[PDB]
Amino acid sequence: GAGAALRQEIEDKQLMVNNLTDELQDAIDEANPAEIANTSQQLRHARADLADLQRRFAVLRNEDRRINQ
């Protein structure tokens, strides 16, 4: 299949997004303004990067399917 390394990056990046979401919510429960700002800034970087990765992979997978059907 096409896009093996990219697919794996997407899963690695979804894991990071999830861990950072955990950390943000914990920082909210603790009312820790510094960590809320630290973690949320990173979470947004990661969520934007993930969405781009997923777009790139969808192109690749749709083209692979059309080439190989």
Residues 6+ apart with CB under 8 A from 61: 1, 2, 3
Cα dihedral: 12, 4, 51, 56 (round 10): 160
Residues in the chain, how many? 69
SS (HEC) of 44-66: HHHHHHHHHHHHHHHHHHHHHHH
In 3D, which of 43, 62, 47 has the Cα closest to residue 1?
A: 62
d(CA 12, CA 20): 13
Resolution of this model in Å is: 2.2
Q: Which domains does the chain possess?
A: 1-69 (1.20.58.90)
CB neighbourhood size of 37 (10 A): 12
Helix (H, G, I), strand (E, B) or coil at 67: helix
List the determination method.
Answer: X-ray
d(CA 58, CA 19): 24
